[PDB]
Subunit: 132 residues, 6 copies
Amino acid sequence: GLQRTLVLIKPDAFERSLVAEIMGRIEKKNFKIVSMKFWSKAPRNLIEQHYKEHSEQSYFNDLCDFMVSGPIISIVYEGTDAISKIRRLQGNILTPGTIRGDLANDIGENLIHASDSEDSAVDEISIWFPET
Amino acid sequence: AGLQRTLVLIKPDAFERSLVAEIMGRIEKKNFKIVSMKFWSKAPRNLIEQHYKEHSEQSYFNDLCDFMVSGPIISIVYEGTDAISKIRRLQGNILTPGTIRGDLANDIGENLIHASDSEDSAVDEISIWFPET
Amino acid sequence: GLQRTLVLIKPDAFERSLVAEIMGRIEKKNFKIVSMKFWSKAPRNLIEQHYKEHSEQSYFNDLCDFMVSGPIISIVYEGTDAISKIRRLQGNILTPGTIRGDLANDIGENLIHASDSEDSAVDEISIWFPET
Amino acid sequence: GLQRTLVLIKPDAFERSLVAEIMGRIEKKNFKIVSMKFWSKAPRNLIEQHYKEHSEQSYFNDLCDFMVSGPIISIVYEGTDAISKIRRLQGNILTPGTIRGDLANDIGENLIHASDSEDSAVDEISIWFPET
Amino acid sequence: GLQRTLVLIKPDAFERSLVAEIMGRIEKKNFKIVSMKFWSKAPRNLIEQHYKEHSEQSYFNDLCDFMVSGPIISIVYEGTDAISKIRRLQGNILTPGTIRGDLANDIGENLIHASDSEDSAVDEISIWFPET
Amino acid sequence: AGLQRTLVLIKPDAFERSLVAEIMGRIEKKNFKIVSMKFWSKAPRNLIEQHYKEHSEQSYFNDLCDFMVSGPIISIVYEGTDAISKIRRLQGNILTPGTIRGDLANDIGENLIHASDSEDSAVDEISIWFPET
Ligand SMILES: Nc1nc2c(ncn2[C@@H]2O[C@H](COP(=O)(O)OP(=O)(O)O)[C@@H](O)[C@H]2O)c(=O)[nH]1
Ligand SMILES: Nc1nc2c(ncn2[C@@H]2O[C@H](COP(=O)(O)OP(=O)(O)O)[C@@H](O)[C@H]2O)c(=O)[nH]1
Ligand SMILES: Nc1nc2c(ncn2[C@@H]2O[C@H](COP(=O)(O)OP(=O)(O)O)[C@@H](O)[C@H]2O)c(=O)[nH]1
Ligand SMILES: Nc1nc2c(ncn2[C@@H]2O[C@H](COP(=O)(O)OP(=O)(O)O)[C@@H](O)[C@H]2O)c(=O)[nH]1
Ligand SMILES: Nc1nc2c(ncn2[C@@H]2O[C@H](COP(=O)(O)OP(=O)(O)O)[C@@H](O)[C@H]2O)c(=O)[nH]1
Ligand SMILES: Nc1nc2c(ncn2[C@@H]2O[C@H](COP(=O)(O)OP(=O)(O)O)[C@@H](O)[C@H]2O)c(=O)[nH]1
Ligand SMILES: [Mg+2]
Ligand SMILES: [Mg+2]
Ligand SMILES: [Mg+2]
Ligand SMILES: [Mg+2]
Ligand SMILES: [Mg+2]
Ligand SMILES: [Mg+2]
């Protein structure tokens, strides 16, 4: 069940120097980088598309601002069951053992994004890596 | 907005085993800040008995108190969003990997760390270890 | 009370350099090594004895071929409630915080074996450490 | 023979979340904590006492302002040849393997203070732990 | 003395899953990613330019082959004295505490490249990140 | 081409302090492979005396032998390019940070690890611990 999924390393990760720590956990679980981009500051449009689902939520504008308040890295990861597994690896701020579980403490500043489904992964990859 | 304070004790087994920084580091990495901290080469047994007052009619009480005064302890007040429950989850238990107790401890009693389990316990415990409120 | 349990570090751990990582996680939870052997290649009979409960499954031959494709280490660990605790440490590939959860991504190539019961434990120890 | 030495964890360590990292390196080399205090803000007189040997240097006021710009932890460590060994552990920003070598990149914001001699040691301990 | 320098993460780093480990050491020393590219397979021309100094050495062709045998990451790092410091961080396979010192064991497969001078850094950055 | 073998001993202090995996991990991370390994809950004192034969007329000899039989040891043969000297550098000494002894040990005698210091010592020591050459 080989899959590709999309990961974003959020600006709080740079602010807090957790970038390598985060990528290390994914690497140590045996997933491979297919492609990767560094954005010293991501175009707002890209963030807006990425989080389009949320444009009606009240928090949507704070969320874009944050995503644009420092660098992000966009990564395409590949491996068996990658979408589901990396999602689990990302976890939530309540569950220790996971990325957000060990390292994050905020509902907004939570370090990493990982596609949550087959469809969102295909969509998300096309946003950040349109050259496909 | 969600900001809380909670009390943590580093227990004597953590010193015996050199896990003090390991334990504090897990809490630090989850973005909690130290707000005050005390090193006790031996904690006054009266502080302990109070801390575990809710356990005074248990079989284990006197061994527990004995263990807690058997080596150094560090009391720490931590601050951050939802600190009481988040630091509690981090503490976990010896059955759940990913947590401090889950990864590092293997005893009912020698379990390395105490964290307040609720707002009331936190206010109460912080009072005990940091009376200069 | 104390128990002893048997652990095998599988060939994928050597291949991926996770031997010390895996043994470290067991060491940190305070379990002690009672017995240990290194097999640059484990005799196939031993492997077949070890997985005899599986001798009818279609994956049996492949499992054994894998277990023989590189070195393994067999270890007897001692500590309170060892069998069950090291089992939980082992986990599965869906559970962050565990050896297999953090480090493994395959159903078969999963780094570590831990006895699953007092009976299997006693049995597996005699297989690998018959001298006792 | 045993010595005691004084260590200060500086405000940049708290700012960058390296407190446990730094204390860990000292812990792993087998030194024990005899005394420890946390100062959300250290009294300026203490800092000026501590760096009194520097009171004539042009950086003196700035150093003190830095040392007062965040929390510090003062620690008395005990162990064999503590003063010299923890000094080496501390190192400088040019020496990989040391606290400052791996973690620091500035001449002044350099994470840790360690007493440099038996005299300065005895002195610095009385400054921070006069009750003794 | 703020500087930018060029780092390559070599294919042996991917092969051995040390990518995050390597970037972590640089990150933990407080250097910042200015820009970054992932090459699933770097154009041979780029490698040839990068190592042009060596085109007369006997090992030059083996070296290019290796640099092209798997992915590389090219990174521009920024910080005080970045060229010299990251160079020291890279070290050599003889000196523990450094990247090649802790993790590498071959004169050719040594995990990381870091510009060794002001001129080579400007040259190297122009190769991998010509958009400047 | 440059391939060698060298003998490593994990000493009893490493078990007492739970540093076994930490020590082996540093060697593993530097790309050296285990070629054979033995666990000794107590090493035969005759093996020790031989291992440290070159030290038989020293003040410290009997304490050293006592220490080496005071808890488990693991003997390991490691293989890799230039293994003898590279694993030696990794061992280092209690004065140099970055090394095993530099980071983890603080005693002349309780220094966690032994590594062969030359081709001759390696052949000789490997003979001792792995006589089935
Ligand atoms: N600033 C802010 N961001 C939020 C809030 N709630 C959610 N978000 C962000 O928007 C995303 C919404 O959560 P969700 O759609 O379930 O994505 P997930 O967290 O990756 O599972 C999260 O990743 C958060 O980063 C909020 O209350 N404030
Ligand atoms: N020695 C011993 N100590 C116990 C026992 N049960 C509880 N304790 C001590 O008291 C605590 C019991 O848990 P609880 O009071 O609910 O707080 P918790 O430790 O944070 O879960 C443990 O941390 C132990 O240190 C026991 O059966 N034996
Ligand atoms: N290749 C393969 N191996 C399997 C499969 N099911 C079980 N195994 C092997 O058996 C183990 C998983 O189930 P089991 O033997 O009952 O328990 P466990 O090994 O302790 O998790 C793994 O170690 C696998 O190596 C399968 O469907 N395919
Ligand atoms: N800002 C600044 N601080 C300095 C300078 N020289 C020394 N210091 C301070 O003094 C220390 C370095 O020299 P010194 O005090 O003699 O010994 P050390 O602190 O143990 O390394 C550092 O902790 C600095 O904070 C300088 O040129 N500028
Ligand atoms: N395959 C191979 N590569 C080499 C050899 N010697 C040097 N190299 C490679 O080419 C570079 C030459 O070394 P040098 O110019 O001093 O660069 P440095 O290692 O980064 O300091 C090294 O980075 C090696 O990766 C060799 O004998 N064989
Ligand atoms: N207790 C004690 N042991 C020593 C002393 N000197 C040497 N040794 C032991 O023998 C070794 C001396 O170093 P050497 O024989 O050259 O081998 P090395 O340990 O790898 O440096 C140390 O590892 C110690 O374990 C000493 O003064 N006291
Ligand atoms: Mg989602
Ligand atoms: Mg408790
Ligand atoms: Mg099974
Ligand atoms: Mg000084
Ligand atoms: Mg060079
Ligand atoms: Mg020795």
